[PDB]
Write an enzyme that holds these catalytic residues in place. Structure first.
Site, PDB file in Angstrom:
ATOM      1  N   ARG A 115      39.113  32.547  48.645  1.00 21.60           N
ATOM      2  CA  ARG A 115      38.194  33.361  47.860  1.00 21.60           C
ATOM      3  C   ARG A 115      38.948  34.432  47.085  1.00 21.60           C
ATOM      4  NH1 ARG A 115      37.526  34.622  53.199  1.00 21.60           N
ATOM      5  NH2 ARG A 115      38.291  36.715  53.697  1.00 21.60           N
ATOM      6  N   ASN A 116      40.140  34.791  47.579  1.00 18.93           N
ATOM      7  CA  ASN A 116      41.045  35.757  46.911  1.00 18.93           C
ATOM      8  C   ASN A 116      42.221  35.167  46.111  1.00 18.93           C
ATOM      9  OD1 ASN A 116      39.503  38.016  47.576  1.00 18.93           O
ATOM     10  ND2 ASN A 116      40.384  38.117  49.652  1.00 18.93           N
ATOM     11  N   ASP A 138      42.976  40.924  44.789  1.00 18.24           N
ATOM     12  CA  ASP A 138      42.686  41.918  45.848  1.00 18.24           C
ATOM     13  C   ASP A 138      43.833  42.270  46.806  1.00 18.24           C
ATOM     14  OD1 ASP A 138      40.287  42.025  44.620  1.00 18.24           O
ATOM     15  OD2 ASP A 138      39.134  41.164  46.298  1.00 18.24           O
ATOM     16  N   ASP A 191      43.991  40.122  53.575  1.00 18.34           N
ATOM     17  CA  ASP A 191      42.790  39.294  53.338  1.00 18.34           C
ATOM     18  C   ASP A 191      43.131  38.118  52.411  1.00 18.34           C
ATOM     19  OD1 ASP A 191      39.398  39.955  52.055  1.00 18.34           O
ATOM     20  OD2 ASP A 191      40.052  38.522  53.539  1.00 18.34           O
TER      21      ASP A 191
HETATM   22  C1  LIG Z   1      37.840  35.596  32.575  1.00 19.73           C
HETATM   23  C2  LIG Z   1      36.407  35.211  32.227  1.00 19.73           C
HETATM   24  C3  LIG Z   1      35.447  35.001  33.397  1.00 19.73           C
HETATM   25  O1  LIG Z   1      34.244  34.829  33.191  1.00 19.73           O
HETATM   26  N1  LIG Z   1      35.976  35.006  34.670  1.00 19.73           N
HETATM   27  C4  LIG Z   1      35.272  34.784  35.901  1.00 19.73           C
HETATM   28  C5  LIG Z   1      33.976  34.292  36.061  1.00 19.73           C
HETATM   29  C6  LIG Z   1      33.439  34.129  37.341  1.00 19.73           C
HETATM   30  C7  LIG Z   1      34.187  34.437  38.473  1.00 19.73           C
HETATM   31  C8  LIG Z   1      35.491  34.918  38.337  1.00 19.73           C
HETATM   32  C9  LIG Z   1      36.210  35.210  39.624  1.00 19.73           C
HETATM   33  C10 LIG Z   1      36.011  35.120  37.046  1.00 19.73           C
HETATM   34  N2  LIG Z   1      37.303  35.551  36.734  1.00 19.73           N
HETATM   35  C11 LIG Z   1      37.814  36.740  37.229  1.00 19.73           C
HETATM   36  N3  LIG Z   1      39.105  36.859  36.866  1.00 19.73           N
HETATM   37  C12 LIG Z   1      39.780  37.939  37.281  1.00 19.73           C
HETATM   38  C13 LIG Z   1      39.114  38.878  38.046  1.00 19.73           C
HETATM   39  C14 LIG Z   1      39.816  39.982  38.492  1.00 19.73           C
HETATM   40  C15 LIG Z   1      39.186  40.923  39.279  1.00 19.73           C
HETATM   41  C16 LIG Z   1      40.011  42.065  39.784  1.00 19.73           C
HETATM   42  C17 LIG Z   1      39.843  43.356  39.456  1.00 19.73           C
HETATM   43 CL1  LIG Z   1      38.681  43.783  38.262  1.00 19.73          CL
HETATM   44  C18 LIG Z   1      40.654  44.388  39.934  1.00 19.73           C
HETATM   45  O2  LIG Z   1      40.400  45.667  39.509  1.00 19.73           O
HETATM   46  C19 LIG Z   1      41.318  46.741  39.918  1.00 19.73           C
HETATM   47  C20 LIG Z   1      41.601  44.092  40.878  1.00 19.73           C
HETATM   48  C21 LIG Z   1      41.787  42.789  41.257  1.00 19.73           C
HETATM   49  O3  LIG Z   1      42.719  42.420  42.169  1.00 19.73           O
HETATM   50  C22 LIG Z   1      44.040  42.978  42.148  1.00 19.73           C
HETATM   51  C23 LIG Z   1      40.970  41.810  40.739  1.00 19.73           C
HETATM   52 CL2  LIG Z   1      41.370  40.231  41.412  1.00 19.73          CL
HETATM   53  C24 LIG Z   1      37.868  40.836  39.626  1.00 19.73           C
HETATM   54  C25 LIG Z   1      37.153  39.701  39.173  1.00 19.73           C
HETATM   55  C26 LIG Z   1      37.798  38.740  38.389  1.00 19.73           C
HETATM   56  N4  LIG Z   1      37.143  37.649  37.941  1.00 19.73           N
END
Ligand SMILES: *CCC(=O)Nc1cccc(C)c1Nc1ncc2cc(-c3c(Cl)c(OC)cc(OC)c3Cl)ccc2n1
Length: 288
Positions: A152-153, A166, A148
């Site tokens: 968006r990722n 992701d 995916d």
């Molecule tokens: C950092 C402060 C903030 O407010 N960030 C923010 C605001 C609005 C939208 C986004 C997309 C973000 N940042 C953000 N940064 C990293 C993120 C990582 C994940 C995430 C998680 Cl929790 C896991 O959990 C196992 C696994 C992932 O992929 C391997 C990811 Cl990408 C989710 C959301 C995030 N949002």
């Protein structure tokens, strides 16, 4: 049950949980002493946890994603695992937090008005594409197939580092639903390669196809792939060899790489290693 992996274990009392980010649910947090070189230092992180309604299956999904992140290791161009909280409470998985959000919204927020030029000139867009390829090169070398890959990722840090998100879900236990609406109402199946769409098979080269689509998203500043086309007729077009046109503002080198990414035969597409080197040469061509 959940086993103590001492070196990944982070005490949950050193987290100060903050604002919900989205939805498995995710919250921003402050963590104290992530880097043991400054053990009282605060850093901002993202914390994933199960929702109240969660089943056995949901727990297995979060766990399997955590375990694949452990196995894959760290790289500057991917969202890295920092910690887990598994003892004396609900499971938390703690990851890097990217302050500028996802690359799709990042691009769309920076589209210029009318013919007036915008901040994201060709070299900037190429550099972005290069960063994504480096992340994917890394994943490729770690035998990870994303399934995916899409703007968006990809998440953008405060220093404009592009990070792949992701990437744990395929080798994980989670089933991707390619007909589940993005926050935008688009369908993930528009990034899927023809071998997966028709022949129902996924290869390492399937992510290269998706990367081609992501390139197109970049140079359209967060445009919708195959715009106007409902998926049903999109799929029949893809039978006859239909490909997206060169977008209005795109260097020909990048359209060339897109066309290469979209060879019908997976065995004919470049690898991310080759893509990294090609984009390195375009950047140099353009910025000198
Ligand atoms: C950092 C402060 C903030 O407010 N960030 C923010 C605001 C609005 C939208 C986004 C997309 C973000 N940042 C953000 N940064 C990293 C993120 C990582 C994940 C995430 C998680 Cl929790 C896991 O959990 C196992 C696994 C992932 O992929 C391997 C990811 Cl990408 C989710 C959301 C995030 N949002």
């Amino acid at each position: 049950d959940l086993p103590l992996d001492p070196l990944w274990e982070f005490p949950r009392d050193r987290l100060v949980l903050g604002k919900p980010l989205g939805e498995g649910q995710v919250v921003r947090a402050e963590a104290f002493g992530m880097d043991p070189a400054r053990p009282d230092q605060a850093s901002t992180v993202a914390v994933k946890m199960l929702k109240d309604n969660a089943s056995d299956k949901d727990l297995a999904d979060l766990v399997s994603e955590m375990e694949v992140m452990k196995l894959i290791g760290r790289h500057k161009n991917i969202i890295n695992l920092l910690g887990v909280c598994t003892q004396e409470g609900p499971l938390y998985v703690i990851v890097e937090c990217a302050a500028k959000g996802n690359l799709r919204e990042f691009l769309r927020a920076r589209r210029p008005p009318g013919s007036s030029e915008g901040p994201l000139s060709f070299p900037v867009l190429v550099s972005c594409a290069y960063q994504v390829a480096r992340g994917m090169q890394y994943l490729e070398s770690r035998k990870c197939i994303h399934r995916d890959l899409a703007a968006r990722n990809v998440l953008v840090t405060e220093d404009n580092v592009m990070k792949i998100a992701d990437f744990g879900l395929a080798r994980g236990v989670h089933h991707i639903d390619y007909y589940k609406k993005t926050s935008n109402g688009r369908l993930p199946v528009k990034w899927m390669a023809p071998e997966a769409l028709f022949d129902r098979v996924y290869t390492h080269q399937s992510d290269v196809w998706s990367f081609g689509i992501l390139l197109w998203e970049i140079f359209t500043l967060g445009g919708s792939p195959y715009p106007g086309i409902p998926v049903e007729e999109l799929f029949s077009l893809l039978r006859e060899g239909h490909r997206m046109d060169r977008p209005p503002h795109c260097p020909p080198e990048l359209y060339g790489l897109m066309r290469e990414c979209w060879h019908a035969a997976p065995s004919q597409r470049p690898t991310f290693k080759q893509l990294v080197e090609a984009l390195d040469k375009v950047l140099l061509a353009v910025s000198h």
